[PDB]
Design a protein around this ligand. Structure first.
Ligand code: ATP
Ligand code: ATP
Ligand code: MG
Ligand code: MG
Lengths: 372, 56, 290, 401
DNA sequence: AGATTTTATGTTTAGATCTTTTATGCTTGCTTTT
DNA sequence: AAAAGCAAGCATAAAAGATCTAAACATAAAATCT
């Protein structure tokens, strides 16, 4: 309906046609595909980078080009979708409609090699999320990357991954032969101005540019590009600003107060309070931070006795510490017996004191050295 | 490099009709192969006979 | 070679010469065919690589016989892979049984059923990276015992016959042959079995807050000539480089993945964060970041 | 033949019926007022409108109504400690949206739901989501392929589909393929999926999900805080209606002693039912405060001092000597040999003889089966290690006072 | 309208993995007899 | 003074111990041959 719901729809975070931030990367990928088409030679490639930087958007944009539709046979395989690491050849056969004698992965591999030896068109095999193909012996990944070096094969394959060094660390054996190792392409995380240009593209495709003044866009991109640089979190906070402003106001451009509030937002039971205070006391008073559940409960019972309030039994105390564990304040390393489980504090005490919000009690527990 | 040198496989079948006397006829019909096979069969059978008669 | 124990108790023209050596070893081949016909197996024990020599024997002489080449210098081959290769491709008998000696019993039965179907077996580096256990050598000796199967093999390691006892060395009916080519070990050492620049290349890909966290560890390391985790946590919360503890643990997990930082736990439970690079190069790196 | 039954089950053509009672259920008018409170206080009776969860209702309702009307799809992650009204609020929002779509005030939408603890395997969710669509039971590979054919391919008129996913941490595993598929399907434009994920831990996407899975899960999130002293009283007094069968101080004591422990609402609705059952056997018709005190002492039980007082005299000598060896050697883990020597000392003091060590191992095995102590298998006698599971002061409190 | 491989599927057990923890061993740094 | 000898210290690694997973094995649905 209105501009708020229009901007909330258009921020989308789905597939797109225009990619303002990735232009030199698209030109480099087009030059790679074009020179390996004109030379009619095979060529492996490994694109990588942090999640949300837009690798799959670039390759989905380049698998819809009409001229590459004329010149080469596109195949896109998402490697999470296969049932197993060795099953991917079978999926590749279904992407090529190859006839197979069937029901073993070896004959599917021989059918793929027999297709590659006498293919009429160049093959572009994009294997999205190739980190799922890594195992231990890694027969499948080496068998896939050995295909460009096969005699007469015309495959040129692209492997998308989040790891900067998956190619070297996971495929050291391809370094020995320079014809085999993939050309590497990083996708750097988005800068501040690139996120501003992505926002100014998405809000001008629907002409809802006016709901975001430039100052608050340059606050939002300055936070997101400094934290992580993925455009998914940027579009998520940009959608969340409008869907909070719609809930709050019911054209008003969003002010810096709303984006600052959602950015500072994004970026107790009494027995749980007594447990956290006794854990802070035992961690402060003692050099040995190997605290067991029983060693903590024996101090917690004395603290509850000196406070003249009833203490929980060990069977309920274990569930209390497990409920405190869900907040992230603690981490319990499990052992053979419930008494032997090791509590480990994961907040500093300056955060625990501000989280408990009962300073008159923590001043009493932390001054109670004699109950340890 | 060589097709036998692969990054993935470790064993390389070169099957030629195996289902489920290496020398040609020039060597087997040579007299020296005949006398060698005769002397070897005689010596091996005599040694096997001695081993059986000692174990009996 | 008669070594003295006191060393333990006190502890161009070359191409033509190598081609003449290779032509002599190529001239040896019919004698190897007769020796393999008599039941002996061939073993080569020269200095240099013998890959091209056994490939020439497979190419020029065994051009029509059934042949299973086995690359023993492969880091990742298994004896199950070789027994599965014989059982599935030579005999069409399907997958071999999971016990390898049961697979050798099956191969002995199926090869007893077919006389004059000889299987040549070429093993470059019988002392291979995954064949150095006693069990794989027992499987190879039980396979070489078969009258149908003939075996050629290469040897490179000096300590190879320590795993051949007299039973294996009797099953391996070896005819030793000094095939000393002088070729370099290219293919045998090409595999996986045998830095400030990389730190800059991974530092370029990091975001601004990760650059600030690593610069904090670099400043503490150059200031102290491994930092406890609590000082890095308080410095990041003061510099607003992190939202909470768990994001800092995720950043240090990424640094452990990219090997910029080694984590050494203390007896007190605190986590120490060493940077595994000498301090002169670290001071040059800090000067590079300014 | 059984195969026709299994084929009619896997095709969904026979509904799984359960056997009905021979006798009719009793009429509502024969019930006592205390029985009426006992059945209104059952945890299974969800109220039509939940007290003290209005803000979270507006949050989930605004998110789901915007995702349905915009026809875009997306994802949400709600989280909180158990019993805090998560799944009841999400199903209440979805029932309100279905009541609104029935009257054509909203676009219509499908409502799939799964739960991660009803699945034996993480991949079996593919079997179940398809079972909420077609109703056929198929293998997980064919179900995953048919779900990808449904979601990746634009097929107008596609309707919006809301996939509630309870118990998200069980679906994880090491590969995290299932949760990656469930969070990756909304990102495609062809699928109008709006997946909501319920879980307990606040920090789950950062603690155990992968970085791309956390990036797909997004930054829209909601946390259900534990019920306080007052909200637990409002819940129980809403469940009781206008009835005065509960004293107000009794509900106040139930809420005050339940909110101090966990903030679970099921604990309050169970303690009030036990208080009603306690008041029923006293032949009173009002749940006075001492019935609540008895039900609280029963359901927050601490019966280990009773176990040490109920032990046989040689087991009490054993429980004294284990704590004596812990005080003597300092370390908390004692071998059976020094425990037996302290046993002989204490038995020489008290004047009774002690059983020989082959019977003392039977005493140690009984205390280790009762979990008063932790102890090893008895095959390594005299060198087995004996942790004390009960606290050392509880033994003196049992055997003195 | 009934028997036979054929194939797709589920279970189980052996092996890969994560993690803690413990130890001999590889090297160091003095240390001390000939 | 030279080179063999005892505490010290981090480190690969070795047990282990739970734990999760991949492939081998038993088994059921089903086209296929009669
Ligand atoms: N340069 C860009 N301009 C506009 N939108 C973009 C750009 N890059 C990415 N996006 C948006 O971000 C969304 C996610 O990008 P994409 O899925 O390609 O990242 P990714 O690297 O594949 O993530 P992951 O590594 O987790 O798979 C896309 O749907 C797209 O709409
Ligand atoms: N605010 C409330 N008002 C009334 N009843 C409530 C409220 N919160 C919880 N309950 C009761 O307690 C029960 C809680 O069930 P619910 O499914 O909400 O728990 P949950 O938070 O999903 O638990 P888990 O996280 O363990 O799945 C409901 O059946 C409901 O009857
Ligand atoms: Mg992607
Ligand atoms: Mg629930």
């Amino acid at each position: 309906r209105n501009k708020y719901q229009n901007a909330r729809r258009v921020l989308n975070s789905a597939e797109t046609q225009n990619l303002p931030g990735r232009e030199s990367q698209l030109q480099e990928l087009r030059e790679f595909f074009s020179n390996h088409l004109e030379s009619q030679t095979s060529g492996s490639l490994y694109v990588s980078g942090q999640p949300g930087t837009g690798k799959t958007a670039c390759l989905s944009l380049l698998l819809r080009d009409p001229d590459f539709s004329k010149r080469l046979q596109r195949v896109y395989i998402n490697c999470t979708s296969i049932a197993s690491v060795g099953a991917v050849y079978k999926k590749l056969c279904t992407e090529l409609q190859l006839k197979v004698s069937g029901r073993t992965e070896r004959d599917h591999l021989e059918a793929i090699q027999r297709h590659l030896k006498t293919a009429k068109r160049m093959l572009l095999l994009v294997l999205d999320e190739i980190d799922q193909l890594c195992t231990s012996r890694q027969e499948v990944l080496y068998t896939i990357f050995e295909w460009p070096a096969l005699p007469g094969s015309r495959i040129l394959l692209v492997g998308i991954a989040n790891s900067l060094d998956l190619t070297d660390r996971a495929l050291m054996r391809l370094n020995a032969r320079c014809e085999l190792k993939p050309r590497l392409m990083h996708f750097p995380p988005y800068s501040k101005q690139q996120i501003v240009e992505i926002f100014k593209s998405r809000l001008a495709e629907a002409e809802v540019l006016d709901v975001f003044p430039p100052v608050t866009l340059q606050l939002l991109a300055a936070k997101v590009s400094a934290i992580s640089g993925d455009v998914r979190r940027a579009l998520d906070i940009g959608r969340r600003v409008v869907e909070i402003a719609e809930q709050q106001k019911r054209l008003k451009p969003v002010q810096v107060t709303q984006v600052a509030a959602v950015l500072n937002k994004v970026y107790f039971p009494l027995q749980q309070k007594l447990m956290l205070c006794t854990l802070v006391l035992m961690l402060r008073n003692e050099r040995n931070k190997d605290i067991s559940m029983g060693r903590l409960h024996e101090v917690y019972r004395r603290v509850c006795a000196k406070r003249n309030i009833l203490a929980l039994d060990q069977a309920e105390f274990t569930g209390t510490v497990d409920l405190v564990e869900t907040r992230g304040i603690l981490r319990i390393m499990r052992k053979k017996e419930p008494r032997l489980h090791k509590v480990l504090l994961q907040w500093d005490e300056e955060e625990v004191h501000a989280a408990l919000s009962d300073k008159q009690l923590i001043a009493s527990i932390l001054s109670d050295t004699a109950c340890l | 490099m060589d097709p036998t040198i692969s990054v993935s496989k470790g064993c390389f079948v070169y099957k030629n009709g195996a289902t489920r006397s290496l020398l040609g006829k020039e060597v087997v019909q040579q007299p020296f192969y005949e006398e060698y096979r005769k002397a070897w069969n005689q010596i091996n059978d005599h040694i096997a006979d001695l081993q059986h008669r000692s174990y009996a | 070679f008669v070594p003295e124990s006191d060393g333990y108790f006190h502890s161009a023209e070359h191409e033509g010469s190598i081609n003449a050596i290779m032509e002599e070893y190529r001239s040896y081949f019919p004698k190897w065919m007769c020796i393999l016909n008599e039941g002996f197996n061939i073993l080569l024990y020269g200095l240099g690589s013998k890959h091209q020599l056994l490939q020439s024997f497979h190419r020029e002489v065994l051009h029509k016989q059934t042949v299973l080449v086995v690359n023993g210098f492969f880091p990742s081959l298994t004896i199950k892979d070789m027994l599965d290769s014989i059982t599935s491709d030579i005999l069409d008998a399907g997958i071999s049984p999971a016990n390898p000696h049961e697979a050798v019993d099956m191969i002995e039965e199926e090869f007893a059923l077919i006389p004059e179907t000889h299987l040549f077996l070429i093993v470059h580096n019988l002392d291979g990276a995954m064949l150095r256990n006693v069990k794989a050598q027992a499987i190879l000796s039980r396979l070489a015992r078969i009258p149908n199967i003939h075996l050629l093999a290469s040897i490179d390691h000096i300590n190879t016959p320590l795993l051949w006892d007299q039973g294996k060395l009797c099953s391996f009916n070896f005819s030793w042959w000094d095939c000393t080519t002088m070729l370099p070990y290219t293919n045998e050492t090409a595999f996986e079995n045998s830095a400030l620049s990389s730190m800059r290349s991974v530092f370029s890909s990091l975001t601004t807050n990760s650059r600030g966290i690593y610069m904090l560890i670099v400043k503490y390391q150059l200031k102290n000539k491994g930092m406890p985790f609590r000082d890095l946590y308080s410095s990041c919360r003061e510099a607003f480089l992190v939202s909470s503890d768990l994001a800092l643990r995720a950043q240090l997990t990424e640094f452990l993945d990219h090997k910029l930082v080694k984590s050494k736990r203390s007896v007190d439970g605190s986590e120490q964060l060493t940077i595994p690079i000498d301090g002169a190069l670290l001071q040059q790196f800090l000067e590079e970041q300014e | 033949t059984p195969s026709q039954k299994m084929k009619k089950i896997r095709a969904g053509e026979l509904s799984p019926s359960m056997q009905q009672r021979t006798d009719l259920p009793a009429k509502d008018s024969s019930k006592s007022e205390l029985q009426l409170a006992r059945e209104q206080l059952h945890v299974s009776v969800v109220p039509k409108s939940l007290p003290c969860r209005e803000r979270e209702f507006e949050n989930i309702y605004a998110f789901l109504e915007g995702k349905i009307q915009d026809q875009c799809g997306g994802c949400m992650y709600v989280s909180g400690v158990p019993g805090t009204g998560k799944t009841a609020t999400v199903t209440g929002v979805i029932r309100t949206l279905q009541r609104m779509a029935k009257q054509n005030e909203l676009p219509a939408f499908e409502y799939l739901e799964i739960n991660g603890m009803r699945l034996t395997e993480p991949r079996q969710a593919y079997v179940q989501i398809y079972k909420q669509l077609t109703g056929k039971t198929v293998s997980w590979e064919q179900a995953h392929a048919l779900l990808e054919k449904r979601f990746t391919t634009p097929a107008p008129r596609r309707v919006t589909t809301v996939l509630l996913v309870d118990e998200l941490d069980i679906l994880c595993n090491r590969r995290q393929d299932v949760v990656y598929n469930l969070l990756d399907w909304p990102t495609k434009s062809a699928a109008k999926l709006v997946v909501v994920t319920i879980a307990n831990t606040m920090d789950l996407p950062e603690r155990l999900l992968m970085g791309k899975v956390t990036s797909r899960l997004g930054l829209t999130r909601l946390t259900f805080q534990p019920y306080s002293h007052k909200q637990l009283q409002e819940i129980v007094t809403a469940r009781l209606g206008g009835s005065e069968t509960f004293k107000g101080e009794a509900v106040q004591l139930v809420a005050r002693k339940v909110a101090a422990v966990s903030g679970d609402a099921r604990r309050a609705l169970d303690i009030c039912r036990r208080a009603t059952e306690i008041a029923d056997t006293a032949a009173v018709k009002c749940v006075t405060m001492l019935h609540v005190q008895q039900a609280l002492a029963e359901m927050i039980a601490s019966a280990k001092v009773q176990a040490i007082r109920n032990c046989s005299r040689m087991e009490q000598i054993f429980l004294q000597a284990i704590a004596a060896e812990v005080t003597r050697t300092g370390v908390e883990e004692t071998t059976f040999m020094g425990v037996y020597q302290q046993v002989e000392t204490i038995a020489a003091f008290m004047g009774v003889t002690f059983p020989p060590p082959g019977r003392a191992l039977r005493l140690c095995s009984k205390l280790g089966a009762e979990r008063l102590i932790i102890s090893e298998h008895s095959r390594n006698d005299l060198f087995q290690k004996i942790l004390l599971n009960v606290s050392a002061d509880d033994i003196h409190y049992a055997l003195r006072v």
